[PDB]
Write a structure and sequence with these properties.
Chain A: May form homodimers and heterodimers with GIPR. The complex is a heterohexamer of chains A (378), B (223), C (59), D (339), E (31) and F (128). With 378 residues, chain A is mostly helical. Chain A contains eleven helices and four strands, in the order H-E-E-E-E-H-H-H-H-H-H-H-H-H-H. Classes of the chains: A mainly alpha (378), B alpha/beta (223), C mainly alpha (59), D mainly beta (339), E mainly alpha (31), F mainly beta (128). The structure holds ligand QW7.
């Protein structure tokens, strides 16, 4: 809630007033000192000099009525357990859960993205280097596969960035590269790249859904113009609503490495076009299953065929998103938030592996092409 | 070598002119639905709403090809019709044993190894002549299993047509369907119809639209 | 069969014309084809592997 | 009591023809070729995979310069390709889209074609008014056309699907002479290297040696057992090997007048569609329907090589007039060059 | 979407843990 | 040379039995599906029966269902057609056309008397 940048600038402001009080106070005992936590001026000897709890803590609103006491003796220094420069510092009054949870769903979606990165670079190698598969449909699937590769790679960059920020600059004690990395541009570029790759994947799921529908529905359509149109929708419209997110995140809410999203409409402007893509992918999903039912109920069992059709047609459209669409942030607060995060991150991290299985590996055309290359490489 | 490079540059300019003309011809070829008509003329009411016929239904351009000016050994020119979309197989369904040889020609079109990916729109003319033929007493002399082929439960007959007429009608419909289901993996489907005068090209357009949709659903492995 | 007797007649004259021709020995024709393939053997860019300089297809 | 008399007399005629073929047949070619050495594993890979067609390539003919090649498709295009710089030289849009043949003239000044339109269209390439246009159309057949060939710059010879070959003069525009005697669809022609007599393979499992001078079937070869699809004379002129739907090639000769060689293995079950020779006459190239092209030793009946490649069947094959390349045109809209 | 929601949650929690560790660094002496 | 010699038939009272046969020489008989076609006087060639390459997948025309039966032997390179319960509709010229390709399931040999791979024909006249 309260940013580390705010805590360190509040501590630096407190230190500035403390140094403006330590050498601009009337001298009277204990030496006027400063143990980097509380300001300790000259006080009364032989007494527990109780200064207030310093108000740069995050829990200042919890206990604003506490105190930190030091046993200012008649020697100018307090007591200790043994020979040490530390005085006696009572900290019992000024003292102070998703740790396994977030790490659990982290390791699930990163094993999903690692397996999808491997399966997707293999499936893109298959659709590139075979020269017979190069129709427009495999071009659409190949740019989809590129969007999955960019999403998983940008999420890898993001998680390396969060580990460099909050893990290996926390157990290490720099605080001169961390809080300045908040104000740097590599931070904001990594999280802007995360937002663009996620929105680009969601609109490429929409582009291949509307491409499947414009194959099944529209009568005559100019092919090579509409493929450049679909590439410009897949890689040009997520740019067109990530750049407004980037400019309102540079102007209005900049501090916090562009990941805190503490104002929620500034996140809702990136969350609503995703909701629009997922909405019309569910409409295209209902239309495609309506078409397949209209074919199966005229071909003079259907449940196994229609079941394989639905479980083949879900991951290229990504309609599992639709089960957790209108439930979102600012509403999901309990463990419903955990079920949402676990389901969406798990199934979207394995949506890569599942489309690279269902649309290159178990595809009959690619298997007959591998059988051809097998029995002509002999 | 200067004029060598200039001649090669002029050849590359000719290459680009021909290549853009051929991509324009690709955009006019891949959207032209063509269809073989191979039934005893009669297409004069199909064109008006010597071999070929370029017509159009609802911004979809069809290329009918009639084969009346060939010999009847069909086994060498019918292998030219691989990229064709539909075969309008016209059966003059009553008039000899024209029906069994029509079934044999349909079985041969069906089981040919270079025509095993394309599908057959099936028209059956002269159904009124078959009505007065079954009301005269002659398909029972030709087809024995017609004696016990009961009328199906999914029948959609003409309301008021005689039941023996619809009996023989859906009998020979399901006989063509037995040929077009006894040997196939789902690559192509026979689309039977009954006519004769009306908008036959509406049935042609709907069935070719269904062919293109089923082909696109087969290449996504949805069907 | 009055149409078919005409093609029967011309088939008969075709066979009696084609029958009375000379037929040299099959061993001589086979030795002729063998000596022809042995004569023009070095002038064949398909069986003899032509190196990359003088065949204008090897890019 | 009349028709049966001359048809059993024709049976007796066929009997003494078969007796004369057997009595002059002391030694087959396969048992006196065992002293000569085979040609080993012949590798040939795709030099140029020229890509221009929208649909299946159904025919092809090299130029006598061994540089240009015509390719005709059921697209309806006839595009004239420069094989070295893998680019186009002309693109003729045809009249009827279903064409089945094409022929580049030995001079180079014309390109004929024809299909199910029953018309041999001869396009000019050397018009003083620029663009290519139809110099002549030939319409005297009642069936389709399967293979047309230029004897010279002046007269064409066509094979039809109504049991007729035909010598046409292009300047007059009508049939100079006909060639009747087949009973099936005449599927391919082959001109002799002296262009005095052509061989015609048809759908009656026979191949007739005609002659263009006086116009008669002088020889008839019945050694196949299915529809003959393609034919090509041996480069000297005394033999020809031809292929049929029974998945074999058979080498006949025009002087000994019988079958000399049979080319078929146990994996060979798809009926073949194109034959050609090398310049030496040692390699019988033969393109099939199992998407490959076997490279037979035309003297020892082995599979010397196998051209892999094409994704659909081939439908035309042509060897350059200097022996440099083997172009195979197919139904996957490409034609590849082999060397 | 949902990966940004997880990134927001893990960044807020890890930032709270980092501020706690920052004051744990200030309470031990030299900070 | 593809030659197909058929033998059998003649003048039989309707209701009896009869047998046709044809020897097939010039090819591997074990690879072609075989047919039986007839020419009625006053009509064209109409199909009667098919059999597969091996002999399993047999098919008849509708007018002869149960009456006729064909049977091939590649070891003898011949084919037999048994006519049980002969009819007055069977007075025709009989032909054993083969089908022009190995290992296929399609045939195009019911032509207007112009086909090469078809026998000469046996007249079977049905009278009193
Ligand atoms: C400490 O800060 C985090 C705490 C929780 C999470 Cl979930 C993350 C996420 C945002 N994270 C980003 N990169 C990460 C790399 C590894 C792990 C991870 C996975 C399994 C076990 C242990 C770990 C961490 C524990 C701390 C030491 C380094 N290894 C977690 C990573 C961070 Cl950084």
């Amino acid at each position: 809630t309260v940013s580390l940048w705010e805590t360190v600038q509040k501590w630096r402001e407190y230190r500035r007033q403390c140094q403006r009080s330590l050498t601009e106070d009337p001298p009277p005992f204990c030496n006027r000192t400063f143990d980097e936590y509380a300001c300790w001026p000259d006080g009364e000897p032989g007494s527990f000099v109780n200064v207030s709890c310093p108000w740069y803590l995050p829990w200042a609103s919890s206990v604003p009525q506490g105190h930190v006491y030091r046993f200012c003796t008649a020697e100018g220094l307090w007591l200790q357990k043994d020979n040490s420069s530390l005085p006696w510092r009572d900290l019992s009054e000024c003292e102070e859960s998703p740790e396994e949870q977030l790490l659990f769903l982290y390791i699930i979606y990163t094993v999903g993205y690692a397996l999808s990165f491997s399966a997707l670079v293999i499936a893109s190698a298959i659709l590139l280097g075979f020269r017979h598969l190069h129709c427009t449909r495999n071009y659409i699937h190949l740019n989809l596969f590129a969007s999955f590769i960019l999403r998983a790679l940008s999420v890898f960059i993001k998680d390396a960035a969060l580990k460099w920020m909050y893990s290996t600059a926390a157990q290490q004690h720099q605080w001169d590269g961390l809080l300045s990395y908040q104000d740097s541009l590599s931070c904001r570029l990594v999280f802007l790249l995360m937002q663009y790759c996620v929105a680009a994947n969601y609109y490429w799921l929409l582009v291949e859904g509307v491409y499947l529908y414009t194959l099944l529905a529209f009568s005559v359509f100019s092919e090579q113009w509409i493929f450049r149109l679909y590439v410009s929708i897949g890689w040009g419209v997520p740019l067109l609503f990530v750049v407004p997110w980037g400019i309102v995140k540079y102007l209005y809410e900049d501090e916090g490495c562009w990941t805190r999203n503490s104002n929620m409409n500034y996140w809702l402007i990136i969350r609503l076009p995703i909701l629009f893509a997922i909405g019309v992918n569910f409409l295209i999903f209902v239309r495609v299953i309506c078409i397949v039912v209209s074919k199966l109920k005229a071909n003079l069992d259907i449940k196994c065929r229609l079941a394989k059709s639905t479980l083949t047609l879900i991951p290229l459209l990504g309609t599992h998103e639709v089960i957790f669409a209108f439930v979102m942030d600012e509403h999901a607060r309990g463990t419903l938030r955990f079920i949402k995060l676990f389901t969406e991150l798990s199934f979207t991290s394995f949506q890569g592996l599942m489309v690279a299985i269902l649309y290159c590996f178990v595809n009959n055309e690619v298997q007959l092409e591998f059988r051809k290359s097998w029995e002509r490489w002999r | 070598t200067e004029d060598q490079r200039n001649e090669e540059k002029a050849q590359r300019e000719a290459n680009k002119k021909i290549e853009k003309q051929l991509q324009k011809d690709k955009q006019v070829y891949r959207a032209t639905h063509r269809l073989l008509l191979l039934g005893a003329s009669g297409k004069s009411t199909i064109v008006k709403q010597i071999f070929e016929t370029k017509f159009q239904v609802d911004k979809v351009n069809f290329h009918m090809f009639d084969v009346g000016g060939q010999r009847d050994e069909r086994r060498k020119w019918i292998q030219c019709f691989n990229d064709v979309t539909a075969i309008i197989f016209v059966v003059a369904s009553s008039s000899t044993n024209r029906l069994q040889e029509a079934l044999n020609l349909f079985k041969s079109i069906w089981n040919n190894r270079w025509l095993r990916t394309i599908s057959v729109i099936l028209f059956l003319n002269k159904q009124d002549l078959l009505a007065e033929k079954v009301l005269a007493g002659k398909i029972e002399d030709y087809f024995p299993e017609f004696a016990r082929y009961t009328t199906p439960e999914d029948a959609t007959p003409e309301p008021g047509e005689d039941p023996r007429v619809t009996r023989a009608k859906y009998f020979i419909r399901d006989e063509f369907l037995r040929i077009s289901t006894a040997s196939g993996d789902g690559r192509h489907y026979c689309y039977p119809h009954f006519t004769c005068d009306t908008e036959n090209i509406r049935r042609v357009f709907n069935d070719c639209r269904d062919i293109i949709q089923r082909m696109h659903l087969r290449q996504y492995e949805l069907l | 069969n009055t149409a078919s007797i005409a093609q029967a007649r011309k088939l008969v004259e075709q066979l009696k014309m084609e029958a009375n021709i000379d037929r040299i020995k099959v061993s001589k024709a086979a030795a002729d084809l063998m000596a022809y393939c042995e004569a023009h053997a070095k002038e064949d860019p398909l069986l003899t592997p032509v190196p990359a300089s003088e065949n204008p297809f090897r890019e | 009591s009349e028709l049966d008399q001359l048809r059993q007399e024709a049976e007796q005629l066929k009997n003494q023809i078969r007796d004369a073929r057997k009595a002059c047949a002391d030694a087959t070619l396969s048992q006196i070729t065992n002293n000569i050495d085979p040609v080993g594993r012949i590798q040939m890979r795709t030099r140029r995979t020229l890509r221009g067609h929208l649909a299946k390539i159904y025919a092809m003919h090299w130029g006598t310069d061994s540089r240009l090649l015509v390719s005709a498709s059921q697209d309806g295009k006839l595009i004239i390709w420069d094989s070295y710089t893998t680019n186009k030289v002309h693109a003729i849009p045809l009249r009827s889209s279903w064409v089945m043949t094409c022929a580049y003239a030995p001079s180079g000044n014309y390109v004929a074609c024809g299909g199910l339109d029953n018309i041999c269209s001869i396009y000019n390439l050397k018009t003083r008014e620029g663009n290519v246009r139809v110099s002549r159309e030939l319409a005297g057949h009642t069936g389709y056309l399967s293979c047309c060939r230029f004897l010279d710059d002046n007269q064409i010879v066509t094979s039809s699907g109504d049991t007729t070959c035909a010598l046409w003069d292009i300047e007059t525009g009508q049939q100079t002479t006909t060639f009747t005697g087949h009973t099936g669809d005449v599927m391919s022609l082959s001109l002799a290297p002296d262009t005095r007599l052509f061989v015609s393979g048809a759908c009656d499992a026979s191949a007739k040696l005609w002659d263009v001078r006086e116009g008669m079937c002088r020889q008839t070869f019945t050694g196949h057992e299915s529809d003959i699809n393609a034919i090509c004379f041996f480069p000297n002129g005394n033999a020809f090997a031809t292929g049929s739907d029974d998945a074999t090639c058979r080498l006949f000769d025009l002087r000994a007048d019988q079958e000399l060689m049979t080319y078929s293995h146990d994996n060979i079950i798809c009926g073949i569609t194109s034959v050609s020779f090398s310049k030496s006459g040692r390699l019988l190239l033969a393109g099939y329907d199992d998407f490959n092209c076997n490279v037979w030793d035309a003297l020892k009946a082995d599979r010397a090589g196998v051209l892999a490649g094409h994704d659909n069947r081939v439908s035309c094959l042509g060897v350059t007039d200097d022996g440099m390349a083997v172009a195979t045109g197919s139904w996957d809209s490409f034609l590849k060059i082999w060397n | 979407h949902a990966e940004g929601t997880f990134t927001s949650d893990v960044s807020s929690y890890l930032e709270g843990q980092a501020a706690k560790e920052f004051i744990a660094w200030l309470v031990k002496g030299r900070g | 040379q593809v030659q197909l010699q058929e033998s059998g038939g003649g003048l039989v009272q309707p209701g009896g039995s009869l047998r046709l046969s044809c020897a097939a020489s010039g090819f591997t008989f074990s690879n072609y599906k075989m047919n039986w076609v007839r020419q009625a006087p006053g009509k064209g060639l109409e199909w009667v029966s098919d059999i597969s390459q091996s002999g399993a997948s047999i098919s008849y025309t509708g007018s002869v269902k149960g009456r006729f039966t064909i049977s091939r032997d590649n070891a003898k390179n011949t084919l037999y057609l048994q006519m049980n319960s002969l009819k007055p509709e069977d007075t025709a010229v009989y032909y054993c056309a083969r089908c022009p390709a190995p290992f296929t399931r399609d045939c195009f040999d019911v032509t207007s008397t112009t086909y090469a791979y078809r026998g000469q024909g046996t007249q079977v006249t049905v009278s009193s």
